[PDB]
Amino acid sequence: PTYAPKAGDTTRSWYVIDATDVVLGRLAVAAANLLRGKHKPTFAPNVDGGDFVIVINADKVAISGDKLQHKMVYRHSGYPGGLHKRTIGELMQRHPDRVVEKAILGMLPKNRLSRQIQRKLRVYAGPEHPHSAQQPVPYELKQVAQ
């Protein structure tokens, strides 16, 4: 049977991704699996496992103008109308961290652990990150084989 599940038997490391030229989707996927812990053999979907993920320089994520001017974002309030339609381009010019956050959350499962995982996410639009007291580990994207 399983050996990984156990209180305290988790290595909470920190990862840093320089999200400059990377595309939003591939970044979000790697962040999702890396965040949940599927890159580790001690996977245990029943618990909040995984490592901490830091997104650096989210402002520079390459997205075509064909989506900046067409991929609309919808936040309905609850009131009549109230469909807060706002372009992803404007969101990139205001709160790109919320755009990236949304993309990741859409790739994470929709359950209680998802929220416990969300609170393990730290996204900053700029490149200068004050969080240097911990042990950041620069992590880059790759294919494996095949």
């Binding site: 990984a4 494996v144 084989a145 095949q146």
Partner: protein
């Protein structure tokens, strides 16, 4: 798959290689090995890599 990716190999080719080697080892105890002795997992990976032919053509 996680341990295999740590050894830079996919699950696909891992199982294919082990079958070519005749290593009729179930996934339960193989996954156990992944935790109890990661080095043994690495050894099995090297065996599979050597057993795999050359490419994706036939």
């Amino acid at each position: 798959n996680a341990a295999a990716r740590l050894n830079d190999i996919t699950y696909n080719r891992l199982i294919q290689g082990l079958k070519a080697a005749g290593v009729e080892v179930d996934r339960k105890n193989l996954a156990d090995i992944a935790i109890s002795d990661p080095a043994a997992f690495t050894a099995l990976v090297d065996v599979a890599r050597a057993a795999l032919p050359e490419d994706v053509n036939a």
